[PDB]
Design a protein around this ligand. Structure first.
Ligand SMILES: Nc1ncnc2c1ncn2[C@@H]1O[C@H](CO)[C@@H](O)[C@H]1O
Lengths: 198, 240
């Protein structure tokens, strides 16, 4: 359970109902702005089955600032916070109309979360830019203090995103790695030959 | 070093640790600026169509209840008829706060016919009072958003200043510098401005102004030919 887990897959086609319920969902989707997902594919993602009561963290940029709000609401969440990551170099200096010094992560709530530690962190992240599309690792610590020890799931993660207490999904992960017996059981029932199609 | 962890340990916000050729543009803006003009008006009871001509940029700073801890709700704000005074091609800068305004201000912009092109974040440091809450908030809120909208056909989207004293509702004057650096035209309106925000190059309209000098005909005369299409960033048009 607690150590990192992941599933290489096309998130459009995986039956995510086999994964159970999560205290926190995070996604850094490949929005079709300017290997992406159309606005309809994003709308149709089966986010609603992933949680009963908890929080969604949704990275947005450009016109996904609006489209991401649409998906969040369609999936059944109310946006209740918005984190910004101020992007710096290793010397703590900031990296169409204006130059962009930040990226935004919408925070949605679904249901009645109980026992979360709201208010420990603030809504600004200052952290160094690494590779492209690589979000800061500080978010995992903020999320862990918010909801310690609970099950969490990340969508469109890459290998460097895998973390304890998290299940990471994405098409650039290496195979499958599952340790939670509840999840292993339901995965074998649903995918007895280990193949994910349609 | 994890500044998020540092904030939970010490109360110093991460933005406390951010660190750190134009004058021949700032003075052109200064040369082109109209005289400051200002009008006391209770905007809830005032027909904004009386403010003419139509504006190249509008700065809208409704007094939200969250600023204090006569306020305007987003119900009130959304019902302002901003489209009636914006020029067919024009810009809006809407201070949305940090709560539901980030959503409802976007509804406002679309309702008035704009699309959002920038999200400018005012990030507030607490260097002077380390340490120190909306019921839905998940995180401590340490920033405000000013949304930039466009209709029709050097700077960064961040303003960093120390958090102001309790009850001080002023927004950073740096928002004016960003707006004026875009060279969007010279008809500039600041709704819900105050005596303290009056500025050359701007028409300021708001309930708390103690004095007025606005005259619609005088104001329009600043933009009649040959000065109808200046950006506010070029030389004055020679006369006589
Ligand atoms: N349908 C998809 N299913 C799973 N991962 C995807 C999909 N589309 C893009 N990605 C991945 O999401 C990540 C975006 O940073 C990249 O690893 C990218 O390949």
């Amino acid at each position: 359970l607690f150590p990192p887990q992941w599933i290489c897959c096309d998130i459009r086609y995986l039956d995510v109902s086999i994964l159970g319920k999560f205290a926190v969902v995070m996604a850094d989707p490949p929005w079709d702005i300017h290997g992406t997902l159309t606005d309809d594919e994003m709308r149709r993602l089966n986010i609603p089955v992933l949680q009963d009561d908890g929080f969604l963290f949704l990275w947005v940029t450009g016109r996904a600032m609006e489209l991401g709000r649409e998906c969040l609401n369609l999936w059944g969440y109310e946006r209740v916070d918005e984190i910004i990551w101020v992007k710096t170099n290793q010397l703590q200096r900031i990296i169409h109309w204006l130059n962009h010094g930040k990226e935004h992560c919408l925070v949605g709530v679904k249901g009645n979360p109980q026992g979360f530690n709201q208010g420990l962190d603030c809504d600004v992240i200052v952290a160094e830019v690494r590779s492209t599309s690589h979000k800061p690792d500080e978010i995992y610590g903020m999320i862990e203090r918010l909801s310690p020890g609970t099950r969490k799931i990340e969508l469109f993660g890459r290998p460097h995103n895998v973390q304890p207490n998290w299940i990471t999904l994405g098409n650039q992960l290496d195979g499958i790695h599952l340790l939670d017996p509840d999840v292993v059981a339901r995965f074998k029932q649903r995918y007895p030959d280990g193949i994910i199609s349609k | 070093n994890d500044y998020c962890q540092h904030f939970v340990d010490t109360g110093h916000r991460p933005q406390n640790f951010i660190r750190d050729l134009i004058r021949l543009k700032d003075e052109l803006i200064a040369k082109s600026n109209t005289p400051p003009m200002y009008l006391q008006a209770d905007i809830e009871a005032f027909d904004i169509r009386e403010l003419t001509p139509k504006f190249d940029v509008i700065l809208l700073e409704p007094p939200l209840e969250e600023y204090y801890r006569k306020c305007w709700t987003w119900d009130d704000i959304m019902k302002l008829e901003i489209d009636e005074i914006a020029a067919p091609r024009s810009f809006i800068f809407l201070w949305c706060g940090s709560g539901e305004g980030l959503d409802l201000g976007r509804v406002c912009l679309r309702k008035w016919g704009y699309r959002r092109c920038e999200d400018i974040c005012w990030i507030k440091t607490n260097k002077n009072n380390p340490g120190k809450l909306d019921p839905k908030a998940v995180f401590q809120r340490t920033k405000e958003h000013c949304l930039m909208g466009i209709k029709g056909t050097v700077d960064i989207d961040l303003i960093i200043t120390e958090e102001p004293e309790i009850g001080n509702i002023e927004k950073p004057v740096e928002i004016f510098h960003i707006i004026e650096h875009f060279c969007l035209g010279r008809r500039r309106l600041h709704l819900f401005g105050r005596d303290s925000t009056i500025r050359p190059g701007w028409l300021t309209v708001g309930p708390t102004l103690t004095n007025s000098n606005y005259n619609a005909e005088t104001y329009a005369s600043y933009f009649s030919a040959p000065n109808s299409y200046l950006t506010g960033c070029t030389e004055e048009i020679e006369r006589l």
